[PDB]
Each structure stands twice: as structure tokens, then as C-alpha cells.
Amino acid sequence: STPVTDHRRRRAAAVISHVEQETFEDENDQQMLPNMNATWVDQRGAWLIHIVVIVLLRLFYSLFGSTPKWTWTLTNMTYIIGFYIMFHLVKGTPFDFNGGAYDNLTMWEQINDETLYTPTRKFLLIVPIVLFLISNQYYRNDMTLFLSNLAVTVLIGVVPKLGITHRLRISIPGITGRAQIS
């Protein structure tokens, strides 16, 4: 019992693993159509909206009355967590693309058809660090807030976006579960 057409999805049999490159048919299916999921990034106003959401968050948290350090740390953590949830958590497309063709890539890896260090990727890398530098001037006298904020930033907003973590899946038993490699 051997299949004439092998289109079967494997799972990671290790702890640290990489998603396997695609074959000829898979590449053709991916390149047949412009990806409707990761093309809005390059259009008019995307960078500006990334700027504006931060200002809105700042005004909201300032409305909650609390001291500058608390408002700024809340702004930083909220933006970083939201960006991670939107761009790095869910893999696939929210609509039927093809035979599926992107069932094991997140939205971050889909940008600019997997071309690294493009201007947009550079901008989205720069934003977290400058946001940390701006907020650094207010809770600088508290070791706990400073350390926690720096940890959250460097570990959630700069590491997943690095060029060495591309197509990197970490699969532990009891939490993440078996990842998808083929």
C-alpha cells in the first residue's frame, strides 16, 4: 500500500527542528497567486498605523490615572504582546488559498514572499527598540520594571523576527505539542 501522490504532512520527531523546504508543486502553488494575507503590509499607511496605535494605547493608559512609569510599561508590554499574537502565533491563512500551501508558516514569514531584511522588515525591527528607548527615561530608577521590560522586549519582540529564527519550531511535550514540518 503505497500512495501514487505523496502530499502528507509530517510532524517534528525532535525537540528543535526546522520546517522542511517545499517541493516543485508547492512552490508553484505558492507563487501562482499574490498572497492576500501578507500584501497589505506594503501599501499606503501601514507604518503610520503602527505608530498611531502606540499613541492611542498611551492616551488610554494615561486616562487610567496611574503614574508615568506604570503607564509606559503597560503601553510597551501591551503593544509587544499584541504584535506577537498577531504576527507570530497563528500559522496559515484565514481563507482558502490553494491545497493550502501556507499551512505551516506564520504571517511574519509570509511577508514579501520570504525575502529577508526588506525595508518593511527593517522598520518592524526598529520599532520595538525605539519604543523601549523612549520609555527608558521614566521607570529607569526601578530595577524590577527595567529588567522585566528589557527581558520582554529582547525576548518577544526582537528574537522571533531575527534572520536565524526563520522557519524554527520548538516542540516540547505537554505544552506546545508536535509541530508540523512537511
Binding site: I126, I129, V130, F132, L133, N136, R140, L150
Partner: peptide, 14 residues
């Protein structure tokens, strides 16, 4: 160390 961290961050930005 604060100026040190900020300088490191500027370097990594570049």
C-alpha cells in the same frame, strides 16, 4: 550601565 545599554541598543540598531 544605563548609558551602556543605550549605546549597545544604538549599535544594534545600526
Amino acid at each position: 550601565g544605563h548609558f551602556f545599554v543605550e549605546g549597545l541598543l544604538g549599535v544594534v540598531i545600526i
